[PDB]
């Protein structure tokens, strides 16, 4: 009978990494799409 | 228990000086009835002159020197440090956000 | 607030700030996001986005809070960051609920001691009795297995916990965890003349 | 309106919510605090029943 | 469109959903079945996470004498030239000759 412990970064750490990867991918795809549309207009 | 107030300690060795040790500790004031100045560790054992929590287990029962007595969250190993670095990042973010909170409009 | 350690919470708050601000800064720079406002729009030129600082911030707060929001991400970047944020929030909430249920259902199935044998199985609570007061001697000369292992623990501790006088043991039980096996009538006389002390067993 | 305010409250306790969500700022804090209360209540209820 | 269907699909997986709700009773069937599948997935994931965090049983990495060999990460040992070394020396089963090597 020992299972009384609050979750911590040692138990939830991958989600923040996934969030950072999503953010950087979002920035990359955003600038890529901006140049796509600007080139298509140009 | 030394009934009197005069102590006698002897060791007899006989070409056996490699004996581990004799090592002890003596505590006074077992006789004194308890008063406000002294401290009641155990039965007829008020011994306090400076003895209260002096770093030595100097009572028959463990009471004389035994367990005499928001900032917790800040005292993390490095979780607080990474948290405040992220906080600086987020302050930078908020201050950047306000710029285009007020800057752009319709077209 | 207990089931999550007081380290994730600041991580969660600062990550909410960061994700919301990244969403805002992306939404203010995109070739897709700007939108024609008029309900029946015949190709006018009054287009803009809909993301301010407050809008993005409370979109992030709502998504963290699982009650939704008012904005509909449109471009690839805004939708991908929103999706990642949703995934984060969903797992955080699910883990929180799981941990709270863990605490409650691990506490609810605790078994406080109610008998000598159940005490004997337990180990942390040190035992005791007034030594050689005809009580511990009963454990000394006993033949029963459970009382034999009781006496084995007694001899293993051997003046770590074997009190010499009643009142010292009483204070020991007051200020610690202890058993102090002693005769019934004095237990009645003490329990009914004090509190916090419970006659356990038979 | 008071009728729809009570509707927003009672439909916010249950996890569905209306479409009359706040369009101002001062009311949004009340909305958010209410949402947090509903989430805490429902999660605690599920935990205790399990 | 080529992307809206994917967007709504992913958005119905997580319990918010977009605002592209179907209108034909031919695709709202797909919407409903997708809803049922995602509801089951999430409401079983939460149950399994609670189960793991409640009754947790950890198991050993290694569970046999042979597993110590062909592993080369635990860095085991023995008493210096006592009785174990005497056995491992000259032991020709060769399951412990890698051990001794």
From Swiss-Prot, chain A:
Record-listed Phosphoserine modification sites: 38
Please share what else the UniProt entry notes about this protein.
The postsynaptic actions of Glu are mediated by a variety of receptors that are named according to their selective agonists. This receptor binds domoate > kainate > quisqualate > glutamate. It does not bind AMPA without coexpression with GRIK5.
In which tissues does this protein get expressed? Highest expression is found in the olfactory lobe, piriform cortex, dentate gyrus, hippocampus, granular cell layer of the cerebellum, and in caudate-putamen.
What is the name of the protein in this document? Glutamate receptor ionotropic, kainate 2
Functionally, this protein is described as follows: Ionotropic glutamate receptor that functions as a cation-permeable ligand-gated ion channel, gated by L-glutamate and the glutamatergic agonist kainic acid. L-glutamate acts as an excitatory neurotransmitter at many synapses in the central nervous system. Binding of the excitatory neurotransmitter L-glutamate induces a conformation change, leading to the opening of the cation channel, and thereby converts the chemical signal to an electrical impulse. The receptor then desensitizes rapidly and enters a transient inactive state, characterized by the presence of bound agonist.
Q: What do we know about how this protein assembles, alone or with others? A: Homotetramer and heterotetramer with GRIK5. Tetramers may be formed by the dimerization of dimers. Assembles into a kainate-gated homomeric channel that does not bind AMPA. Can form functional heteromeric receptors with GRIK4 and GRIK5. Can form functional heteromeric receptors with GRIK3. Interacts with DLG4. Interacts with NETO2. Interacts (via C-terminus) with KLHL17 (via kelch repeats); the interaction targets GRIK2 for degradation via ubiquitin-proteasome pathway.
Post-translational modification comment from the UniProt entry:
Sumoylation mediates kainate receptor-mediated endocytosis and regulates synaptic transmission. Sumoylation is enhanced by PIAS3 and desumoylated by SENP1. Ubiquitinated. Ubiquitination regulates the GRIK2 levels at the synapse by leading kainate receptor degradation through proteasome.
Stretches that traverse the bilayer:
12-32
Organism annotation: Rattus norvegicus (Rat)
UniProtKB/Swiss-Prot annotation, chain B:
Q: Which domain of life is it from?
A: Eukaryota
Tissue specificity is:
Brain (at protein level).
> What is known about its processing and modification?
N-glycosylated.
In the UniProt record, which residues carry a glycan?
Answer: 48
| Annotated LDL-receptor class A domain residues | 33-69
- What does the UniProt entry say about where the protein is found? Membrane
Where would you find the membrane-spanning parts of this chain?
79-99
Disulfide bond annotation, renumbered to this chain: 34-46, 41-59, 53-68
Q: What does this protein do?
A: Accessory subunit of neuronal kainate-sensitive glutamate receptors, GRIK2 and GRIK3. Increases kainate-receptor channel activity, slowing the decay kinetics of the receptors, without affecting their expression at the cell surface, and increasing the open probability of the receptor channels. Modulates the agonist sensitivity of kainate receptors. Slows the decay of kainate receptor-mediated excitatory postsynaptic currents (EPSCs), thus directly influencing synaptic transmission.
Subunit record text: Interacts with GRIK2 and GRIK3, but neither with AMPA-nor with NMDA-sensitive glutamate receptors.
Question: What's the protein called, per UniProt?
Answer: Neuropilin and tolloid-like protein 2
Q: Which organism is it from?
A: Rattus norvegicus
Its taxonomic placement starts with: Eukaryota, Metazoa, Chordata, Craniata, Vertebrata
According to the record, which residues of the full protein are present here?
Answer: 264 to 376 of 525
């Amino acid at each position: 009978s020992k299972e009384a412990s609050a979750l911590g970064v040692q138990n939830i750490g991958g989600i923040f990494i996934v969030l950072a990867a999503g953010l950087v991918l979002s920035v990359f795809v955003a600038v890529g799409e901006f140049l796509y549309k600007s080139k298509k207009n140009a | 228990m030394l009934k009197t107030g005069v102590g006698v300690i002897r060791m007899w060795a006989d070409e056996g000086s490699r004996l581990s040790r004799f090592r002890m500790l003596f505590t006074s004031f077992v006789e004194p009835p308890c008063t406000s100045s002294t401290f009641f560790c155990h039965s007829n054992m008020c011994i306090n002159n400076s003895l209260v929590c002096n770093g030595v287990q100097n009572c028959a029962y463990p009471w004389d020197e035994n367990h005499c007595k928001l900032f917790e969250q800040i005292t993390k190993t490095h979780g607080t440090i990474i948290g405040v670095t992220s906080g600086i990042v987020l302050v930078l973010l908020i201050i950047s956000i306000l710029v285009q909170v007020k800057q752009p409009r319709k077209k | 607030l207990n089931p999550l350690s007081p380290d994730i919470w600041m991580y969660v708050l600062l990550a909410c700030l960061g994700v919301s601000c990244v969403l805002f800064v992306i939404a203010r720079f995109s070739p897709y996001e700007w939108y024609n406002p008029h309900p029946c729009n015949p190709d006018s030129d009054v287009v803009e986005n809909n993301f301010t600082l407050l809008n993005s911030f409370w979109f992030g707060v709502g998504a963290l809070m699982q009650q939704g929001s008012e904005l509909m991400p449109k471009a690839l970047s805004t939708r991908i960051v929103g999706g990642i944020w949703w995934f984060f929030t969903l797992i955080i909430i699910s883990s929180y609920t799981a941990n709270l249920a863990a605490f409650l259902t691990v506490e609810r199935m605790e078994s406080p001691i109610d008998s000598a044998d159940d005490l004997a199985k337990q180990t942390k609570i040190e035992y005791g009795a007034v030594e050689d007061g005809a009580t511990m001697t009963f454990f000394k000369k006993s033949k029963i297995s459970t009382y034999d292992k009781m006496w084995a623990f007694m001899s293993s501790r051997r003046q770590s916990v074997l009190v010499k006088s009643n009142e010292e043991g009483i204070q020991r039980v007051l200020t610690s965890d202890y058993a102090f096996l002693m005769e019934s009538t004095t237990i009645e006389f003490v329990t009914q003349r004090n509190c916090n002390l419970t006659q356990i067993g038979g």
